[PDB]
Design a protein around this ligand. Structure first.
Ligand code: NA
Ligand code: NA
Ligand code: NA
Ligand code: NA
Ligand SMILES: [Zn+2]
Ligand SMILES: [Zn+2]
Lengths: 292, 122
């Protein structure tokens, strides 16, 4: 009952320490749908609750923040999630989005094509993904292989991620990478609690493993949580938008070498008080296959 | 001197009984905003709905060039406030209306730059 007032529910830490056997995700509240505010799309409601929850975390929010959003195109050719991120993020935040098919966006720049065709010369402060690619319930690669590589090469230390997963759309390597953040969780939006969907949130990237995570076991732990803790569908949090905007912390950004990352630096990164990356001109590109 | 006139084509389509462009992205907001027409964040007042700008632009939605030399969009990356009575056709509203360059309110839907303001208040 108490969770219905929240934007959603984060997986309790005790589940991360178990070794569950994988099995079907069978939700008691499945097939159902929540009562959305008049004319509000499920994608706007879902992203609003994700941002409402991200507000409670130690996200680094530097001036000139850099955010990239994957899987941003809707079936109707617009970008509802991008519109919510731009509302949530401080004005002036650089926002780039991307998807497989054409769509019209409020993002500063939009890349169309397979996410594997996306290249950026710069590092990012936040990565959001709504990409969906399911597949026997074994670890799936495809865009998950790309996102694991993108996180390890283009995420600034201190940066965070919110990557959508489901019972069948997940990757063992992505769960292993959550151990490379100061903290992580699986977050279920209350408006979509009847789905196996969750956002894997990595908070404050350390660029190295703080904890060894077996991704196959951790997905089984996630499913066990969803199977045993029913989450009541709720749109309650969507009606009070007074504290919605991400607070501009003006988090310090500095370019330190890999050999200068000591324990004091790791401690600042872990508190959301530091971003490590150069602050060069943001340059992105989408590879084009040439064929006659 | 040929040039596609998308604006006139949409207005004629609406006058003939055509269904307005749909899937404009409506945002959640307090509805206690300034009520200005086009803002960096949702500013809907109690009589308006805030929408993602790109989704309410005829040119953006029809994948057509913007009718100005620099091909610049006044809506993309911003939020447009649409009177609730016109929220069923945000694209038609933005096309048919003009933002006051002085107060930033829609002309005929917020702009009071032309009112008397004769009796002053203490
Ligand atoms: Na904003
Ligand atoms: Na070709
Ligand atoms: Na109407
Ligand atoms: Na206009
Ligand atoms: Zn436009
Ligand atoms: Zn005016």
């Amino acid at each position: 009952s108490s969770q219905a007032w929240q934007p959603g529910v984060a997986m309790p830490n005790l589940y991360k320490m178990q070794r569950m056997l994988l099995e079907k995700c069978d939700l008691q509240n499945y097939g159902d749908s929540a009562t959305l505010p008049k004319g509000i799309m499920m994608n706007v409601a879902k992203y609003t609750q994700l941002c409402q929850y991200l507000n409670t975390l130690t996200l680094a929010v530097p001036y000139n923040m850099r955010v990239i959003h994957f899987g941003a195109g809707s079936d109707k050719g617009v970008a509802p999630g991008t519109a919510v991120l731009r509302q949530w993020l401080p004005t002036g935040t650089l926002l780039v989005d991307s998807d497989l098919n054409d769509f019209v966006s409020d993002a500063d720049s939009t890349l169309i094509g397979d996410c594997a065709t996306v290249h950026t010369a710069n590092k990012w402060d936040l990565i959001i993904s709504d990409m969906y690619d399911p597949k026997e319930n074994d670890s799936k690669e495809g865009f998950f292989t790309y996102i694991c590589g993108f996180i390890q090469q283009k995420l600034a230390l201190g940066g965070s991620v919110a990557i959508k997963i489901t019972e069948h759309s997940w990757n063992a390597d992505l769960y292993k990478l959550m151990g490379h953040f100061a903290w992580w969780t699986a977050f279920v939006t209350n408006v979509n609690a009847s789905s196996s969907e969750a956002f894997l949130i990595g908070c404050n990237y350390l660029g190295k493993p703080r904890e060894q995570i077996d991704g196959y076991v951790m997905h089984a732990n996630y499913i066990f949580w969803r199977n045993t803790n029913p989450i009541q569908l709720s749109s309650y949090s969507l009606f009070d938008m007074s504290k919605f905007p991400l607070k501009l912390r003006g988090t310090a950004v500095m370019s330190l070498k890999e050999g200068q990352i000591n324990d004091m630096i790791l401690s600042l990164l872990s508190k959301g008080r530091l971003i490590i990356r150069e602050n060069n001109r943001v340059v992105i590109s989408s590879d084009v296959l040439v064929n006659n | 001197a040929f040039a596609v006139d998308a604006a006139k084509a949409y207005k004629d389509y609406l006058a003939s009984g055509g269904q307005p462009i749909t899937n404009c992205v409506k945002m959640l907001c307090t509805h206690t905003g300034t009520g200005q027409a086009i803002t960096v964040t949702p500013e809907a007042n109690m009589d308006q709905e805030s929408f993602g700008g790109a989704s309410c632009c005829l040119y953006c939605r029809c994948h057509i060039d913007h009718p100005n030399p620099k091909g610049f969009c006044d809506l993309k990356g911003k939020y447009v406030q649409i009177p609730t009575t016109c929220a069923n056709d945000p694209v038609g509203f933005t096309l048919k209306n003009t933002v006051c360059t002085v107060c930033g309110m829609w002309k005929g839907y917020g702009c009071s730059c032309d009112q008397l303001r004769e009796p002053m208040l203490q």
